[PDB]
Write a protein that binds this DNA or RNA. Structure first.
Ligand SMILES: [Ca+2]
Ligand SMILES: [Ca+2]
Lengths: 220, 215
DNA sequence: GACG
DNA sequence: GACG
């Protein structure tokens, strides 16, 4: 066990202004914190039902004004735009936001592990970049992270498929994901797939977790 | 009139150990913050769409005492299980969390809760008074959604589910979680949004003046 | 009433 | 890929 046992899985999703090469800026952030026990506590039916979210969960979802415009594809994919976020008086990614995250993370049983779909290549690096702009320390220096793409690959294989979020979900449950437009929608889809084999999901997390502090920024 | 235009409405629901006479404690809290521009037919109207741009908080909270049998049934929460999954009490750090969430909202902000004048507002105040640090809410306003809807409806029940079903002809989606209750409340308040805002602005009062439920 |  |  690299860093022992993670008592909390925090499912994470960021919506943003664009894809990596565009030096994107977060526009929406969702966190769903789950005690590992909530994720242990058998599917019946065909096709296999979408699992019940555990009762005990902490949830945080925030809209964030970016400093640059949303690319057309981001804006269509999210239903968000820079002008709208300002009209609705959203604030930039700031130190206060970091305090909010800090306090939220602190409310969870340590050690905590962030889980995001393609997180090692998207969410984690971009979140690293956002916090670096800030005049405060990172609230995640003690937090851990793993990528759920590598997780379900090593899970299905235990027994030419895409491993995009929506593809894995429709593979498993034969339904379209309920919400594809919001950060929370992405996190709930992520949670359902991660509930497919909770037992083994956890085992794999506990052994592949790595310090968030070792994630390299998306851009400088 | 009295405190200017509210810029943020925060929809609030508390799950707890019991009804007021049991001197209950919070077991779950949900905040849903919506800018006033997000608000500002027919027969029945469909259930309104929640605005795209929202801030949302939902936390489970370990109470100091057991849930009454009745509260456990309708909330799916128990002290034992909240403890098994390592929830923290209503503590100082929760206040820090709450304060940061709130200061991400454009002021002035108004708390909106259903029967909030008799239940959520005094219960929250009782919870907050218990802490060492100052209340992160003393700058905030509040209003009860029950009166609002009595006023906006032009003898029958004004419970959450009753208004909702009289308006949209459907049962609420989720009556078992704080988030569920907040969403039902939001739909209710989205029925006549401008009229609702109207009534909130006029009736907003300081949350500093809300009397603790007990203690 | 109506709130857990 | 796969993330917006
Ligand atoms: Ca994503
Ligand atoms: Ca309530």
């Amino acid at each position: 066990l690299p860093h022992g046992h993670m008592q909390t899985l925090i499912f994470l999703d960021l919506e943003a202004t664009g894809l990596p090469s565009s030096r994107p800026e977060v526009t929406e952030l969702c966190l769903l914190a789950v005690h590992r026990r909530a994720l242990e506590n058998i599917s019946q039916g065909h096709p296999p039902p979408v699992p019940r979210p555990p009762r005990v969960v902490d949830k945080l979802s925030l809209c964030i004004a970016p400093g640059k415009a949303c690319s057309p594809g981001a804006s269509e994919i999210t239903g968000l735009s820079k002008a709208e976020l300002e009209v609705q008086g959203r604030q930039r990614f700031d130190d206060n936001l970091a305090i909010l995250l800090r306090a939220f993370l602190q409310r969870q049983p340590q050690p905590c592990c962030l889980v995001a779909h393609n997180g090692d290549r998207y969410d984690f690096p971009l979140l690293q970049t956002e916090l670096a702009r800030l005049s405060t320390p990172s609230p995640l220096d003690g937090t851990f992270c793993v990528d759920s793409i590598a997780a379900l690959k090593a899970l299905e294989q235990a027994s030419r498929k895409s491993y995009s979020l929506g593809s894995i979900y429709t593979r498993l449950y034969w339904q379209a994901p309920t919400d594809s437009h919001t950060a929370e929608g992405h996190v709930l889809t992520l949670l359902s797939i991660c509930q497919w084999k909770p037992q083994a999901l956890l085992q794999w997390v506990d052994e592949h977790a790595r310090p968030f502090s070792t994630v390299k920024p998306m851009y400088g």
